[PDB]
Amino acid sequence: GSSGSSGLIACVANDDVFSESETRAKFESLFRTYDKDTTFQYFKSFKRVRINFSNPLSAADARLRLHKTEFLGKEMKLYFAQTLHIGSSHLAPPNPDKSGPSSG
Numbered sequence: 001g002s003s004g005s006s007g008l009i010a011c012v013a014n015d016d017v018f019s020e021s022e023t024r025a026k027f028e029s030l031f032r033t034y035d036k037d038t039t040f041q042y043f044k045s046f047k048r049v050r051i052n053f054s055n056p057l058s059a060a061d062a063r064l065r066l067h068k069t070e071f072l073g074k075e076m077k078l079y080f081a082q083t084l085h086i087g088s089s090h091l092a093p094p095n096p097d098k099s100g101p102s103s104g
Contacts, residue, residue, distance in 0.1 A: 002104075006053040007081035008062055013074045018044055023072070030066055034058040050081065 008031075016023040024042075027049070031038050037054040053059045059080075067078045 003084075004056060005081065005084050006056045006059045007084075008051045008053070008059050009079040009081050010049040010051055010066065011047065011077035011079070012049060012071065013047070013076065014072060015047075017049075018042055018047075026072060030071075031058075031062050034062055034065075 010027075010031075012018075012027065014023065017027050018024070028040055031040070031051050031053075035053050035055070035058045038058070039052040041050040041052070043049070051062070053062070063078050063080075066076065068075050
């Protein structure tokens with residue numbers, strides 16, 4: 001699966017978590033602790049946090065180890081990011097180009 005989806009949309013109610021103060025870290029550590037290549041994307045106003053992982057494994061544990069779990073006293077939620085971007089078969093791409101794929 002060259003291009004696989006391994007993200008998670010964590011919904012936090014603590015408006016503070018959306019600050020550089022520190023409250024944020026705590027939230028990150030929760031996931032970061034698992035994977036180090038995990039990326040975090042905070043969306044102000046949308047009260048959403050997209051956490052991308054390096055493998056479809058951690059993403060799972062990140063849910064059980066989190067979610068409803070009372071995060072600092074406030075219950076947080078987590079949804080499985082549906083795919084990456086719009087799919088569906090469309091106008092086939094133009095002729096390919098020279099390339100040398102490696103093993104996997």
